[PDB]
UniProtKB/Swiss-Prot annotation, chain A:
UniProt subcellular location: Nucleus
Top-level class of the enzyme under EC nomenclature: transferase
GO MF term list: DNA binding; DNA-directed RNA polymerase activity; mRNA binding; ribonucleoside binding; zinc ion binding
A GO CC term attached to the entry: cytoplasmic stress granule
Lineage: Eukaryota, Fungi, Dikarya, Ascomycota, Saccharomycotina
Protein name per its UniProtKB record: DNA-directed RNA polymerase II subunit RPB2
Residue span relative to the full protein: 21 to 784 of 1224
GO biological process, one term: transcription by RNA polymerase II
Organism field: Saccharomyces cerevisiae (strain ATCC 204508 / S288c) (Baker's yeast)
Gene: RPB2
Predominant subcellular localization, coarse grouping: nucleus
Note: The binding of ribonucleoside triphosphate to the RNA polymerase II transcribing complex probably involves a two-step mechanism. The initial binding seems to occur at the entry (E) site and involves a magnesium ion coordinated by three conserved aspartate residues of the two largest RNA Pol II subunits.
Curated annotation (Swiss-Prot), chain B:
Cellular compartments per GO CC: nucleolus; nucleus; RNA polymerase II, core complex
Localization, UniProt: Nucleus, Nucleolus
Main subcellular localisation: nucleus
Residue spans, zinc finger TFIIS-type: 71-111
Name the record gives this protein: DNA-directed RNA polymerase II subunit RPB9
Classification lineage: Eukaryota, Fungi, Dikarya, Ascomycota, Saccharomycotina
Keywords carried by this UniProt record: DNA damage, DNA repair, DNA-directed RNA polymerase, Metal-binding, Nucleus, Phosphoprotein, Transcription, Zinc, Zinc-finger
Zn-finger segments (C4-type): 7-32
Transferase found in the keyword field: no
Species: Saccharomyces cerevisiae (strain ATCC 204508 / S288c) (Baker's yeast)
Record's keyword annotation contains Oxidoreductase: no
Quaternary state and interactors: Component of the RNA polymerase II (Pol II) complex consisting of 12 subunits.
Note: Present with 2440 molecules/cell in log phase SD medium.
Curated annotation (Swiss-Prot), chain C:
Functional summary from the UniProt entry: DNA-dependent RNA polymerase catalyzes the transcription of DNA into RNA using the four ribonucleoside triphosphates as substrates. Largest and catalytic component of RNA polymerase II which synthesizes mRNA precursors and many functional non-coding RNAs. Forms the polymerase active center together with the second largest subunit. Pol II is the central component of the basal RNA polymerase II transcription machinery. During a transcription cycle, Pol II, general transcription factors and the Mediator complex assemble as the preinitiation complex (PIC) at the promoter.
Further information: Mutagenesis experiments demonstrate that the minimum viable CTD contains eight consensus Y-S-P-T-S-P-[A-S-N-G] heptapeptide repeats. Identical and simultaneous substitutions in a number of consecutive repeats are lethal: 'Ser-2' -> 'Ala-2' (14 repeats), 'Ser-5' -> 'Ala-5' (15 repeats), '2-Ser-Pro-Thr-Ser-5'-> '2-Ala-Pro-Thr-Ala-5' (10 repeats), 'Ser-2'-> 'Glu-2' (15 repeats), 'Ser-5' -> 'Glu-5' (12 repeats), '2-Ser-Pro-3' -> '2-Pro-Ser-3' (15 repeats) and 'Tyr-1' -> 'Phe-1' (12 repeats).
Protein name: DNA-directed RNA polymerase II subunit RPB1
Family according to the record: Belongs to the RNA polymerase beta' chain family.
From Swiss-Prot, chain E:
Subcellular location: Nucleus
Organism: Saccharomyces cerevisiae (strain ATCC 204508 / S288c) (Baker's yeast)
Known partners and oligomeric status: TFIIF is composed of three different subunits: TFG1/RAP74, TFG2/RAP30 and TAF14.
Chain positions with Phosphoserine modification: S1
Family in the record: Belongs to the TFIIF beta subunit family.
Organism domain of life: Eukaryota
Protein name: Transcription initiation factor IIF subunit beta
Function: TFIIF is a general transcription initiation factor that binds to RNA polymerase II. Its functions include the recruitment of RNA polymerase II to the promoter bound DNA-TBP-TFIIB complex, decreasing the affinity of RNA polymerase II for non-specific DNA, allowing for the subsequent recruitment of TFIIE and TFIIH, and facilitating RNA polymerase II elongation.
Residues of the full protein shown: 56 to 249 of 400
Misc: Present with 520 molecules/cell in log phase SD medium.
């Protein structure tokens, strides 16, 4: 029962995987995340609306200043239903929406509370408002203000189809072979194809050809910061300059450090360079010190900043305050926004310029822009959140404008009249139907093709359509590198199946087991990380400990550490034992002494096995055994013991395209022990195994027989032509 | 090899200056009154081409990287036959393919090129 | 990728040596390419140094300088272009140390004088000391480094020992 | 090796903390600065709520320190005041200020 | 309100870092009345330090934690107090830096880490 594993067990585990997740799980999970959590936060961002009407001083009775406060509360979502022209209300089902050209959607209810404050406007004195009237109907059903209608994706949590059995689907006349994952808009089925994006909060070092004085560039997007190094290699003149937002001329780096709060010159180099012995680092920083030594004053730099604003002739002190506020408000917002976090910003700027200068000293290379680990996929959820935020902002602006208008006439406003509930509904319906992802007024410049009409020609065509990703680069753009297949696509993208013509390589189809992460909070991770022996970045001195690992969380440096091996072992223990959900990625780079933790959304991951060293057998072996496979067979035939049972026991692990840079995988299980030509790989420190190589293929190419005896373009051609065969697209 | 020298008062780097009546070099801080006596006529250095031998880079805890290969060559110091080996980690274009071996036990660095 | 193919004379076509002489006579050679260490050093008193290697070269020219050079001893900059020159690069272009190092360089603007050794020394060390009038202003004379770093850069970049412009390589 | 010493853990009541507001006073220097010699008593400390930075000037004006508030110190520090009985009393930390010397 | 009280500032003061939950639990006002709430134990070699909470406290909190040394020598840190221009008084100079971690021997660690799991699951973004 302690025996090794054979490929039959691999197919057993895959059978469990598809019996648990499904082929369209990504859309459903993104929609559930959006509806349950993000929708509440989008309104809670802008709950309070304020009107401050000062006294017109026309008469004594007009000397009272007024304040109006509007606040929002919970969100309630009903099951989809329709009200006919007669005013009768009945629950809407997909059949009626399809036949009658309706729109599958539901209604949204939000709590609203109002407050009125009145103060006596005494000139020369601060206004002291007092609570007088507060309208809050939380104790009655009239408090739920109807705000709009939201489309519903099939088979999601709210839809009636979620809990339907086979006889339920037949009496309602469903195809049991239908999976959901699409909207019904205007009586036609629509689907949202995943949209590819380049990640943010990651410093990237580039390079330039030299007809121009530019030599290197360091980029970060949080708001953008460019710290450029000018001066050719080997010359005496070295310049390092940063380009801040709303500052045009630009100013050097030592001036930035002086303005930021680090006055002494010796501390600058402790911020930049973390190794005392290296002399080339300081040699390249010498001209910066020489030029920045002339001015020991923040205020000259702040005067530099003040002149370049649109307003001209401002007094010096106001310019000082303005330039002071620019740093904490718009300079690297992804670290912090509130006041007093200057040490973190100074160290992060030092780290960025350190990495730029390291690349400038040929110790490393340019960042690869094609690496699939630096790309995120936007599903229905994020796109809906974007559009909902925009429309809600416009709607609340309109409410404020109308309420001001009715205050001008001294008329009480009905909250059920100030709201134009048609704005949200019309905007969402127009965006989903036309596909132009933007406002109706500015739809010309918005993204297109985001929403497409589902293809039902054959069943495999529906399957292939619900699993498609688009790379929003100009399809006539002559950039060859995004088109070509890249080393990081192993197991996450189908190599065979791609369109032909102008969309070659730009349209991608996932493999059978490449899921996507939903999103999770980073705060508990940071709290635990500081709990288990992490020194904060405030109390970090380079010279006391020059061999300290740096610690990152989603691209913001929080400090250092001294013994990282046990931290990684404990972190992976907790990730494997369910204390943290396995969608979080945790990489360690030994060569540069770095730790990176990612908890964001949009990362493609695939399952893999786990290799551990068994001393009783004297060598390594998988954690999985014949007992687990027997339990899987028992549960499958009984259709308990499921895929999550394997996951929580530390038998499988989800690996993205970034952690893969620091692992070793044995492809066949028998390759882990000490026709065709199969070579015995020299490795002996294996960490994971491939569940099965066949899964590196999509859904289209999983029907060719013996695909490896074929030239690859032939596999591509059949993956194309498999969507034009005639057959039973649905059993109903 | 010129070394930066910081003033003992405000940590600022010391600028050179000359003393004509005694004809001697001094280092002064432009912000305070500190002056210190130069010990050598070597203040600045500007090399052009680097004749640096290729370096293995960071070595600390390199034996726990599981993507690094192995070899059965014998240690020249502790006579152990297990070690890690890798190519030069400096990314110059023209670097040769000369290996570097780090011993497992004594953490001793050596190369496969035994030139006398 | 522009290019240019040159065919040699009928007599020199079959022999490699005249071909290499022509190749040296065509390629563009500049000072920055021929210095393994064109190091900007402090040269407060060029009369004597601490480094033993340049000390041998010192007495060579100090017994080999004319009366005008003896008068101009004070014109030599308080900083030095100390040229450790690579033997291989110098011999590759058939570049004699003295004639090419000094004739054209001093003829161009009478800007930089040199104490230079014969090629037989194990370390080819040149001392490039710029020449300026003593009539320089007091504020000017104080800012030695300010003039000399700039003129040293303009010296490395803008002096052509031999060759024709814009031709990066000849093969 | 199991010999240990005994330090009881005491505290300071609310009546003393009400009129005693604590503030972490941090000086930036590369040298061990002590007020016994480097400060000529008395010292003048004022603010010229966190908008005005702290200013600590000596009687002769030679030693002037300007202190700014550093925020985001997520470590809630504690003060361990030693009493006459050798016990340690806890004092919660309210604010932290960093001082630098005037040029 | 100008002079500094250095008459009793000669004694060295420990610098200890407490965990967030433990520190917040120790900010309780009712327990500030000079009550003896815990004790420390120092090894003969001084490498291992154990903090044991007194039994007078509720059994809902772990009664054992361990301490680790960050810097063997700690310099240029002073502890002050300010009371009612405000009158300031230095308390002393800092001697050692130590950090608190939960003890594995006390099972209550798991419980609070269980609560940590309870913290992890509820909040979402």
């Amino acid at each position: 029962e302690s025996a090794p594993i054979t490929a039959e067990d691999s197919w057993a585990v895959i059978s469990a995987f598809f019996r648990e997740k499904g082929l369209v799980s990504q859309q459903l999970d993104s929609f559930n995340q959006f509806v349950d959590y993000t929708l509440q936060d989008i309104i809670c961002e802008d709950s309070t609306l304020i009107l401050e009407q000062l006294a017109q001083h026309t008469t004594e009775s007009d000397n009272i200043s007024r304040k109006y406060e509007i606040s929002f509360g919970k969100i309630y979502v009903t099951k989809p239903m329709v009200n006919e022209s007669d005013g009768v209300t009945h629950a809407l089902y997909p059949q009626e929406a399809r036949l009658r050209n309706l729109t599958y959607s539901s209604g949204l209810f939000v709590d609203v509370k109002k407050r009125t404050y009145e103060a006596i406007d005494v000139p020369g004195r601060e206004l002291k408002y007092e609570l007088i009237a507060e309208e809050s109907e939380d104790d009655s059903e009239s408090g739920k203000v109807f705000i709009g209608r939201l489309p519903i994706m099939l088979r999601s949590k709210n839809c009636y189809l979620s809990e339907a059995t086979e006889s339920d689907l037949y009496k309602l006349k469903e195809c049991p072979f239908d999976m959901g994952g699409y909207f019904i808009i205007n009586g036609s089925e629509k689907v949202l194809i995943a949209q590819e994006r380049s990640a943010g909060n990651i410093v990237q070092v580039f390079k330039k050809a030299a007809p121009s004085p530019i030599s290197h560039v360091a980029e970060i997007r949080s708001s953008t910061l460019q710290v450029k190094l000018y001066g050719r290699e080997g010359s005496s003149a070295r310049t390092i300059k940063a380009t801040l937002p709303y500052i045009k001329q630009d100013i050097p780096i030592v001036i930035i450090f002086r303005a930021l709060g680090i006055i002494p010159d010796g501390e600058i180099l402790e911020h930049i360079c973390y190794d005392v012995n290296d002399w080339q680092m300081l040699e390249m920083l010498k001209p910066c010190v020489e030029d920045g030594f002339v001015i020991q004053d923040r205020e000259t730099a702040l005067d530099f900043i003040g002149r370049r604003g649109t307003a001209l002739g401002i007094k010096k002190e106001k310019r000082i305050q303005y330039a002071k506020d620019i740093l904490q408000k718009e300079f690297l917002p992804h670290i912090t926004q509130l006041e007093g976090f200057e040490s973190r910003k100074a160290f992060f700027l030092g780290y960025m310029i350190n990495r730029l200068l390291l690349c400038a000293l040929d110790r490393k290379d340019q960042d690869d822009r094609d690496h699939f680990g630096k790309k995120r996929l936007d599903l229905a959820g994020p796109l809906l959140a974007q559009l909902f935020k925009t429309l809600f902002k416009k709607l609340t602006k309109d409410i404020f404008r109308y309420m001001q208008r009715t205050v001008e006439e001294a008329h009480d406003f009905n909250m059920k009249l100030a709201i134009n509930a048609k704005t949200i509904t019309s905007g969402l319906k127009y965006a989903l139907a036309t596909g132009n992802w933007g406002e109706q007024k500015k739809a010309m410049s918005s993204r297109a093709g985001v929403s497409q009409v589902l293809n039902r020609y054959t069943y495999s065509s529906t399957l292939s359509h619900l699993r498609r990703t688009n790379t929003p680069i100009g399809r006539d753009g002559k950039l060859a590198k995004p088109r070509q297949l890249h080393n990081t696509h192993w197991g996450l993208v189908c190599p065979a199946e791609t369109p032909e013509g102008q969309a070659c390589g730009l349209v991608k189809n996932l493999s059978l087991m490449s899921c996507i992460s939903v999103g999770t909070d980073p705060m508990p991770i940071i709290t635990f990380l500081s709990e288990w022996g992490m020194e904060p970045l405030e109390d970090y001195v380079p010279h006391q400990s020059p061999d300290a690992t740096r610690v990152f969380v989603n691209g913001v440096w929080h400090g250092v550490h001294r013994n990282p091996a046990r931290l990684m072992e404990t972190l992976r223990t907790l990730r494997r034992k369910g204390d943290i959900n396995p969608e979080v990625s945790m990489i360690r780079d030994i060569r540069e002494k770095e730790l990176k933790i990612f908890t964001d959304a949009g990362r493609v991951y695939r399952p893999l096995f786990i290799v551990e060293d068994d001393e009783s057998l004297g060598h390594k072996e998988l954690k999985v055994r014949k007992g687990h496979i027997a339990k899987l067979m028992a549960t499958e035939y009984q259709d308990e013991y499921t895929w999550s049972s394997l996951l929580n026991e530390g038998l499988v692990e989800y690996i993205d395209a970034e952690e893969e840079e620091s692992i070793l995988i044995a492809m066949q299980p028998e390759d882990l022990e000490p026709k065709r030509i199969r070579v015995s790989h020299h490795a002996t420190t294996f960490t994971h195994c491939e569940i099965h190589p066949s899964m590196i293929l999509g859904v289209a190419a999983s029907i060719i027989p013996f695909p490896d005896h074929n030239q690859s373009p032939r596999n591509t051609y059949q993956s194309a032509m498999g969507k034009q065969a005639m057959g039973v697209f649905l059993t109903n | 090899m010129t070394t930066f020298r910081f003033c003992r008062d405000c940590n600022n780097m010391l600028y050179p200056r000359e003393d004509k009546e005694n004809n001697r070099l001094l280092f002064e801080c432009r912000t305070c009154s500190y002056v210190e006596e130069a010990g050598s006529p070597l203040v600045y250095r500007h090399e052009l081409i680097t004749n640096i031998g290729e370096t293995a880079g960071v070595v600390q805890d390199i034996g726990s990287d599981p993507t690094l290969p192995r070899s059965d060559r014998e240690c020249p110091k502790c006579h152990s036959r297990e070690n890690v080996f890798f190519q030069s980690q400096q990314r110059r274009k023209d670097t040769s393919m000369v290996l570097f071996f780090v011993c497992l036990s004594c953490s001793h660095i050596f190369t496969s090129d035994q030139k006398n | 990728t522009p290019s240019l193919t040159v065919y040699l004379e009928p007599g020199h076509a079959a022999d490699q040596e005249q071909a290499k002489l022509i190749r040296s006579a065509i390629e563009h050679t500049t000072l920055k390419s021929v210095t393994i260490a064109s190091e900007i050093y402090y040269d407060p008193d060029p009369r004597s140094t601490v480094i033993p290697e340049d000390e041998e070269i010192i007495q060579l020219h100090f017994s080999l300088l004319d009366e005008e050079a003896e008068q101009s001893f004070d014109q030599q900059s308080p900083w030095l272009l100390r040229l450790e020159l690579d033997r291989a690069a110098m011999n590759d272009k058939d570049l004699t140390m003295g004639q090419v190092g000094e004739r054209i360089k001093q003829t161009f603007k009478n800007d930089l004088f040199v104490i230079w050794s014969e090629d037989n020394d194990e370390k080819l060390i040149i001392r490039c000391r710029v020449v300026r009038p003593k009539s320089l202003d007091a504020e000017t004379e104080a800012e030695e480094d300010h003039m000399l770093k700039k003129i040293e850069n303009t010296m490395l970049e803008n002096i052509t020992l031999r060759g024709v412009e814009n031709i990066e390589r000849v093969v | 090796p199991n010999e240990y010493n005994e330090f009881p853990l005491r505290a300071i009541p609310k009546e003393d903390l009400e009129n005693m507001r604590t503030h972490l006073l941090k000086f930036q220097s590369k040298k061990k600065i002590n007020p016994v010699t480097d400060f000529h008593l008395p010292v003048r400390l004022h603010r010229k709520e966190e908008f005005y930075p702290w200013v600590m000037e000596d009687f002769d004006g030679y030693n002037t320190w300007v202190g700014s508030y550093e925020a985001g110190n997520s470590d809630s520090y504690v003060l361990l005041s030693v009493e006459d009985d050798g016990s340690f009393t806890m004092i919660p930390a309210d604010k932290v200020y960093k001082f630098t010397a005037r040029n | 309100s100008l002079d500094l009280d250095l008459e009793r500032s000669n004694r060295q003061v420990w610098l200890v870092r407490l965990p967030m939950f433990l520190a917040e639990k120790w900010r309780d006002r009712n327990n500030l009345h000079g009550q003896e709430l815990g004790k420390i134990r120092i090894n003969k070699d001084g490498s291992k330090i154990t903090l044991l909470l007194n039994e007078n406290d509720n059994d809902s909190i772990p009664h054992e934690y361990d301490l680790e040394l960050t810097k063997k020598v700690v310099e240029n840190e002073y502890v002050f107090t300010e009371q009612n221009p405000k009158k300031t008084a230095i308390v002393g100079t800092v001697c050692h830096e130590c950090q608190v971690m939960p003890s594995m021997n006390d099972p209550n660690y798991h419980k609070i880490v269980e609560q940590r799991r309870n913290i992890v699951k509820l909040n979402n973004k």
